[PDB]
Amino acid sequence: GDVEKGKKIFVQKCAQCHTVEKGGKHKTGPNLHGLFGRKTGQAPGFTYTDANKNKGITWKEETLMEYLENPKKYIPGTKMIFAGIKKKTEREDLIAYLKKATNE
Ligand code: HEC
8 A cells, every 4th residue: 555645544534533653642532552462351451342353353454444444344333434436446546554653
């Protein structure tokens, strides 16, 4: 993906509820630093729904590609409000940006 476009997408569609920087505060949603290779529902200090807490998957590109297309469908009962990113290219860009920034 295009990391720069991914950043734009993050700023426009995710930043209002999430941070990606280390020690960034929990907002409406959990901080996403260290997201890749981590199980669902594990950010310490965030109170998840039971659905998100017990989804039982590992966040990585494949799982993010599916989630971000339609969060509700992938984790029914999530309290995250997001319709989904319908275009594959934009999803890849965002995911590529998150892969960089959440490990940075
Ligand atoms: C508020 C309006 C949000 C927007 C916009 C986005 N997210 Fe979100 N996200 C939000 C909440 C409240 C939660 C917790 C959900 C629950 O049911 O407990 C989430 C959760 C996630 C997760 C899962 C993280 C985990 O630790 O398991 C991810 C990966 C995530 N959110 C990513 C994400 C992205 C990439 C967004 C923009 C594309 C985005 N979210 C928007 C609240 C909100």
